[PDB]
Every structure is written in structure tokens, then in C-alpha cells.
Amino acid sequence: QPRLKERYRSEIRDALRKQFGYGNVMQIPTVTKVVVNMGVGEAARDAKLINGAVNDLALITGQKPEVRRARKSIAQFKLREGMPVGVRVTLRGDRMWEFLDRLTSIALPRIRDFRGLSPKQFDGVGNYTFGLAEQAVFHEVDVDKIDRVRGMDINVVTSAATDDEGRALLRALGFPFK
Amino acid sequence: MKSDIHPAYEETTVVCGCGNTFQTRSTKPGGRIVVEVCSQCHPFYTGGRVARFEKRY
Amino acid sequence: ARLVGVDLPRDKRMEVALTYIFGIGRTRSNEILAATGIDRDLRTRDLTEEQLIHLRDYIEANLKVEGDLRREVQADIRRKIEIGCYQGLRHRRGMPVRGQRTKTNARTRKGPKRTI
Amino acid sequence: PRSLKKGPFVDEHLLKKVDVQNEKNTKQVIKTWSRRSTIIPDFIGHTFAVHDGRKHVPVFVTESMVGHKLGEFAPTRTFKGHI
RNA sequence: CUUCACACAUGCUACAAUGGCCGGUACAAAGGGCUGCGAUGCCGCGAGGUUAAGCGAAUCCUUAAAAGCCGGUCUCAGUUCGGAUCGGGGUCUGCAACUCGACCCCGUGAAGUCGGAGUCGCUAGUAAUCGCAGAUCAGCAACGCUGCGGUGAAUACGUUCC
Ligand SMILES: [Mg+2]
Ligand SMILES: [Mg+2]
Ligand SMILES: [Mg+2]
Ligand SMILES: [Mg+2]
Ligand SMILES: [Mg+2]
Ligand SMILES: [Mg+2]
Ligand SMILES: [Mg+2]
Ligand SMILES: [Mg+2]
Ligand SMILES: [Mg+2]
Ligand SMILES: [Mg+2]
Ligand SMILES: [Zn+2]
């Protein structure tokens, strides 16, 4: 049983209810999904991301990601239509709960010069986004068998309708902000 | 489709030098993971020229 | 293993591996080892997490590491730039500041021979 | 004079001009010709038109130019990019 | 008089394992010294500072020679090679060291992996290599100059050819 989900259902829901006077119990914000994508640049060159992106995202997250191919063609990026440029996975349910717990517990503090996630990177609707720049510190992946380094980004989507509610939900969940 | 595609996701346990230990389900590593810093011990979670001239002279 | 940097070059004496951190070199590593007690001549693969965790607190107790040292350096040079002294003007022009000759040298501060 | 045995180096004919004014006010532009005098923490709020060979460069210390020198801020030579 | 988009000339440094570091360790010459040589002792990792004896000198200082030898480490790597640049902190002389001095401590640690066509010096205690001293001078010369000493080679058949 996801301990972060249990802690949420135990106290975070009540905390959000106290913070915002919702008229009904299901007006309370709740995280819907967590999405992690690559968007690699080695699409027109050497075309080798199935081992560069999928093989690490699968062990980082818990499910194999979906491959995204180019939606257009750009000469400046040497981008053609039809070849993969990015790999995206989405985490939901108890898998998302465990991934968020593991992140906030051991991964976020463990990167270089962790000074806290900026609380101003919200999209304006109640969902947050931030991303790293290298092979993350996830203990699931070790440097000894990785190719050229590549970073990743996370989109966390919540039931909240406002940025303040989203920030409060993340703070209660355990996101270290400024 | 979860037949052979997804990597293994089996119960694990995190052991930290601080002492903060919790158990979840992780990827292919089925054993333990040894860490030295956790959320309970990392920073950010627990928190003059004139003066230099004065101490110099 | 990692304290701040990689700190673990393969098959290297940790005496010299400590020099790979930003803030400790030969003498700093020697004085740290003298204080701690662990011998210099030992391969880094034999070092253990207990020794790492007693070493981790010592460096942050008095010395400094990657990131903040370079932040202090860049703050110092930036303040020197904005205050507008002779050294600050030399830094703004990229020319060496410590009175070295500029007629036939300073190729490190500038680029190689331009040959205009 | 860069030694922890005599304090800093400040000219007496400069002290007898700055200490007689800083009691009541920060004086206006002042004339000085000794670039070699150290800035004691008494020049805050004042100005010094320091000589550099041909003219006087007015220099104001706000908070930080205490370990510096008066002539440090007066370009003794002028270079303007042969090309 | 010391600038700086550039080029030349003369020297040093390296690009390493004939090596780097740690500890121990033996052998010189010639010079300098009352505006000085500072024997010891103390403080400081350190350069340096302090009180102080002997020394117009074969009796005092300089004075420890380094190359040489032993044991461990490193294992051909932009490296335990390389020390240019930069930040911080001290010492010495000088009234005054940003311009505009030298040295000491920490950290950061660039090019460089033997150098194109071409070009320089060298036949014996020579080239090669490592240290020492003087003169100028308050400080600036262990990258210049002049002398000193240690270890220490290979080639010359021949004068046609520059
Ligand atoms: Mg000249
Ligand atoms: Mg020379
Ligand atoms: Mg070395
Ligand atoms: Mg030795
Ligand atoms: Mg001592
Ligand atoms: Mg090599
Ligand atoms: Mg190179
Ligand atoms: Mg080097
Ligand atoms: Mg050649
Ligand atoms: Mg002399
Ligand atoms: Zn911990």
C-alpha cells in the first residue's frame, strides 16, 4: 500500500479542506498523473535512443515509456518527419504515488546543489513542471552502464484549479519550495 | 500490455545512514539500496570589506 | 561513491582522489588524512561507507566544496568589475591583472596569436 | 604599509585635511597628488580627485573601497584598440 | 621609461616512468662578510621575526651541496608530468610596492604528448647535465653577466661535395 497515498488520504485532504472552504468533499485538489519525457536531440544523428531513453526510463519509473515521433520537419534542427525525437511515459495510481514518494524522499535532495524547487513554475491552472539536465541520481540507474548523459523533465497534474491550491498541495505532499 | 514489456516492479526497502528507512516497490534491483543522505538529513530541509579591514588593521 | 564530486577515479590512491575535489589538493588532503587517521596509501575501491560518512562531515566543517567556492570567486571578480579599479578594468578587458608584461605575452588571458 | 606591524599607510598631510572636515561634513571635490595613500575607513561619503599624471580623477568610496588605493581607480595609461 | 590587435631574436619550463612524491643518506671548488656574516634558542607548515655569542676573518658565519644510494607508492594517463593564469591569506626592504619589487601558505590547475620547410652549438674532462659564489642594489639577478666544482660519453674512414 502506497504510504504517501495513505498519508494523503489521512491528513492532506483535511488540510486542504481547512485551507480552502470547499462546499463538497470532492472539490479537494488531488494529483492526477505524473509525466516524464526525454525530448532527445539525437533524432537526426545516430538515431539510437531506444537504449538511450527507454532502457533507463523503464527502470527509473516502473513502466516502459511510449515513443514519440516527430510531428513535423525542421531543416534548422535537421528535423525530418517520422523519426522519434522524444520518449514520454506517464505514471498514475499507486505507481505514481510510489514514484513521487521515492522522488521527494531520496532523489530531489540528492542532485547537485539542491537549493529547492522554484514555486513559480506553475502553468497557471494547478499543475507544476520542472526538469533536470542529466542522468538523474536515481539509484535505479548507475553510471557504470549508461551512454552519453541526458536529462529529463516531470509534469505533475493535479485536480486543483488554481496555482495557489496546486502549490499548497505540493507543499503538503512534501515538495521543497523557496 | 504487461506481459514481458514492463520492467520488474517488486517490493524493496530503502536504508539510509540517517536512519530514515521506508519500504516501497522499485525496479529490477530486488535487494537493498545503500544511501547516505535522505529527506530528513539533507540541507534545505532542516536549514564585509570594512570588517575585513578592521580585522586586518 | 560521491560526496560532492565523483571523488573516485578508478584504481587511485584516495590521497590523490581528494585532490579531485574543488577545495582540496595535495597539502589539504595530507592535513585532512593526518587529522582523520586513515593512511594515504590505499586504493579507493577498498574505502567503505563508514569512512566516507566520517569524511563527509569533516570537509564541510571547515573547508569548502564545489559550487559555493566558485560562487564566491565569481562574486569577487564581479564586484571587482563593477567597482572600476585598475584590476577591474583589466578583468573587463581580459588582460592579466598582476602587473605582467603585455607586449609579447598574456596568451593565456587572451587567445592564441591572432595573426590579423 | 602591507605589514601587520605599523598599520596602514596614510599621509599626514592628507589626514590633517580629511579629519578636519569629516567632523562636520563631507567636503566637496578635493585636490590630492599622492596616489600612494591607503583609504582608511574615514573616507566614506567623501570624494577625491586623484591625480593620474595629467589630470585628477574624482573617486567616491561607498562601502567597499577600503582595502584599495586612491590611484587604483585612476587609469595611468590609456589604450583604445589599435584596430 | 614596465602599454598591446601583432612579428622577430636570446634564455627557462615542460610535454614524463633515464620519471614524480615520502623517509633516510655521502662527497666540492671558488668567493662574500661592522650600514655586515646573525652560531645556537624560541615563534610560526612555511618565507620570515625575536634576544644573543664568535667573526676585519685557514680559527666565526656562509655551510645543507645537488646530481649519486637505499625502501615504499604511482603504472603511460593531459597523469602523483606540466606550473601559466586566477581568488583568498602572510613575510621582507623601501616614507610610500594598483601602475611599481621579491618571497611564503591554501585552493583553482591552461597550452603542451618531442615541434613544418628550415635552422644553432659541440672533438675531452669537450659536448650533456646538476648545483655554488661575486658585481650592480635598501628591496628587484636559483630565466641576464662573470667565474667555480661534481658525474660524464659516441664519432673523425676521408677532404669530392655547401
Ligand atoms: Mg625597456
Ligand atoms: Mg634569459
Ligand atoms: Mg609536481
Ligand atoms: Mg628528498
Ligand atoms: Mg619553527
Ligand atoms: Mg604518454
Ligand atoms: Mg591538449
Ligand atoms: Mg599541471
Ligand atoms: Mg622536425
Ligand atoms: Mg646582489
Ligand atoms: Zn538520511
Q: Cα(A122)–Cα(B13) distance, rounded to whole angstroms? A: 32
To the question of whether residue B31 is assigned a binding role by annotation, the answer is no
* Residue among A42, A45, A46, A85 at smallest CA distance from A66: A85
> At residue B20, what are phi and psi to the nearest 5 degrees?
-65, 105
Number of helices followed by number of strands (H, E) in chain B: 1, 4
| Residue B8 DSSP one-character state | P
Residue type, D54: R
Partner B contacted by D41 (CB < 8 A): yes
In whole angstroms, give the CA distance from residue D38 to residue D8: 7
Write the burial class of residue C23 (CB in 10 Å: 0-12 exposed, 13-18 middle, 19+ buried): middle
Q: Which amino acid is at A24?
A: N
Among C107, D55, B44, which residue's Cα sits nearest to residue A114? B44
The neighbour count for residue C49, using CB atoms within 10 Å, is: 13
To one decimal, the resolution in angstroms is: 2.6
Closest CA to A107 of A61, A158, A73, A48: A61
Helix H or strand E segment including A96? helix A94-102
Comparing CB atoms, the residue among B5, B39, B43 nearest residue A105 is B39
Q: Would you call D41 and B56 a contact, using CB atoms and an 8 Å cutoff? A: no
Residue written as grid cell 545512514: B17
Q: How far apart are CA C92 and CA C94, in angstroms?
A: 5
Diameter over CA atoms, chain A = 56
**Cα–Cα dist A140/B29, whole Å:** 7
B16 assigned binding-site residue: yes
For residue D77, what is the DSSP state?
Answer: S
The β-bridge partners of A87 are A67
Closest CA to B53 of C30, D43, A89, C107: D43
DSSP symbols for C37-68: ---SS-BGGG--HHHHHHHHHHHHHHS--TTH
DSSP-derived letter for residue A23 is: S
Place of cell 530531489: A108
DSSP 3-state percent helix, strand, coil across chain A (nearest 5): 35, 20, 45
With b for 16 or more beta-carbon neighbours within 10 A and e for fewer, the D59-72 pattern comes to bebeebbbbbbbbb
Contact of A121 with A130, CB cutoff 8 Å: yes
Chain C interface with B: residues with Cβ < 8 Å: 49, 52-53, 56
Give the three-class secondary structure for B40. coil
Whether C67 contacts chain A with CB within 8 A: yes
User: Which DSSP state fits C87?
Assistant: H
Determine the Cα–Cα distance for residues A106 and B2; give it in Å rounded to an integer.
27
CA proximity to C91, closest of C81, C101, C106: C81
Euclidean distance between CA atoms A95 and A113, whole angstroms: 28
- The dihedral built from the CA positions of residue A37, A43, A48 and A50, taken in this order, carries a sign that is positive
d(CA C59, CA C69): 13
Phi-psi region for residue A39, left (φ > 0), alpha (ψ -120 to 50) or beta? left
CB atoms within 5 A of ion ligand 11 belong to B 16, 18, 20, 38, 41
Residue A6 grid coordinates: 495513505
> Cα–chain-centroid distance for residue A94?
15
